[PDB]
């Protein structure tokens, strides 16, 4: 009886196995754009993905992850609210059953069709597993998806999903350039938070870009053909793999822009 996103094992149940689910810095949150304050102390954000080395794509039963080689400083996130160097390890998405829901963060209570999470770890902790035990261990770059024009840089991901339909399937996924998933502007909001899935560790600096990317209805329809289940088990479509907004508590969301 493992965690997931069903009626019986979904987000409102997670606190029984992961009591930090009711903690002081949980994610995601609603970004109230009128209360977020411009912070002129935020240094410029530096996304350096030219040397990124993707390896594999995996269906892990709750999303699909594109994994990178993080054994040197090839693809790094720096600047903005961050002290030091954060190495890209994986990206994944959260999405809905319908275009009106799917994002984890909300903007003035608006839900987007999906949300991309580019996950990075603080290299001063030596490995990812050590970094997730630290309050500044991870930086997650969050990017909203809206349905409109296709995102050409997404299509190589969309086209491999048929090969990883079910939990535990992986496929080789080399030479994928995550720069193709970025919007034009790097204007962002930032706050301290958590992983949005169990174990819900409070180790994340969140950086959520204001500008959504556009993907086509056919692109997001292909995400919704994935399965939560393993091969040879009852088919359960991988949809609505998002945690709703959590209480902000004693936190301020800062804006990089006026
Ligand atoms: N939705 S979210 O953005 O808040 C979020 C971000 C990150 C996580 C943790 C997911 N775990 C992840 S992504 N892990 C587990 C692990 O120990 N290793 C470390 C070793 C390794 C090496 C190469 C490539 C991958 C890995 C995995 C990655 C969970 C949730
Ligand atoms: Zn995520």
User: CB–CB of 91/115 below 8 Å?
Assistant: no
Q: Is the CB of 197 inside a 6 Å radius of any atom of ligand 1?
A: yes
Q: Which residues pair with 139 in a beta bridge?
A: 120, 205
Report whether 171 contacts 232 (CB < 8 A). Answer: no
The tokens for 202 are 């409070």
Distance CA 167, CA 107 (A): 31
Do the beta carbons of residue 178 and residue 49 sit within 8 Å? yes
**Structural domains of the chain in order of their starting residue, each with its CATH number:** 2-258 (3.10.200.10)
Q: How far apart are CA 176 and CA 26, in angstroms?
A: 31
What residues contact residue 229 under an 8 Å CB cut-off, 6+ apart? 61, 166, 167, 235, 236
Whether 205 is in the pocket of ligand 1, judged by its Cβ within 6 Å, is: no
Q: Resolution in angstroms for this experimental structure?
A: 1.4
Burial of 249 (0-12, 13-18, 19+ CB in 10 A): exposed
Cα angle 70, 73, 79 (rounded to 5 degrees) comes to 115
Q: What angle do CA 27, 52, 45 make, to 5 degrees?
A: 50
Identify the active-site residue in 8, 13, 34, 62.
Answer: 62
Which residues fall in the annotated binding site? 92, 94, 117, 196-197
Pick the atom of ligand 1 nearest to 128's CA: 19
- CB of 226 within 6 A of ligand 1: the answer is no
Phi, psi of 155 (to 5 degrees): -60, -30
C-alpha to C-alpha distance for 173 and 57, rounded to whole angstroms: 6
* Structure token pair of residue 59: 């269906």
Q: Whose CA is nearest to atom 4 of ligand 1?
A: 195
Q: Is the CB of 18 under 6 A from ligand 1?
A: no
Residue 132: Cβ within 10 Å count: 18
Structure-determination approach: X-ray
Encode 157-172: b = buried (16+ Cβ within 10 Å), e = exposed.
bbebbeebbbbebbee
Q: Is 15 marked active-site?
A: no
């Amino acid at each position: 009886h493992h965690w997931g996103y069903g009626k019986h094992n979904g987000p409102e149940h997670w606190h029984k196995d992961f009591p930090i689910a009711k903690g002081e810095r949980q994610s995601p949150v609603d970004i109230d754009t009128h209360t977020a304050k411009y912070d002129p102390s935020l240094k410029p954000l530096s996304v350096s993905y030219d040397q990124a080395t993707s390896l594999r794509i995996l269906n892990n039963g709750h999303a699909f992850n594109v994994e990178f080689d993080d054994s040197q400083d090839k693809a790094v996130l720096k600047g903005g609210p961050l002290d030091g160097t954060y190495r890209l390890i994986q990206f994944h998405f959260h999405w809905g059953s319908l275009d009106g829901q799917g994002s984890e963060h909300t903007v003035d209570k608006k839900k987007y069709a999906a949300e991309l999470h580019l996950v990075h770890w603080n290299t001063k902790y030596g490995d990812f597993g050590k970094a997730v035990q630290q309050p500044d261990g991870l930086a997650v770059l969050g990017i909203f998806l809206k349905v409109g024009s296709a995102k050409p840089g997404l299509q190589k991901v969309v086209d491999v999903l048929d090969s990883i339909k079910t939990k535990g399937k992986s496929a080789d996924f080399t030479n994928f350039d995550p720069r193709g998933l970025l919007p034009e502007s790097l204007d962002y909001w930032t706050y301290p938070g958590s992983l949005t899935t169990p174990p819900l560790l409070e180790c994340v600096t969140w950086i959520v870009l204001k500008e959504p990317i556009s993907v086509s209805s056919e692109q997001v329809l292909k995400f919704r053909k994935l399965n939560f289940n393993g091969e040879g088990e009852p088919e359960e479509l991988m949809v609505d793999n998002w945690r709703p907004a959590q209480p902000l508590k004693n936190r301020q969301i800062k804006a990089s822009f006026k």
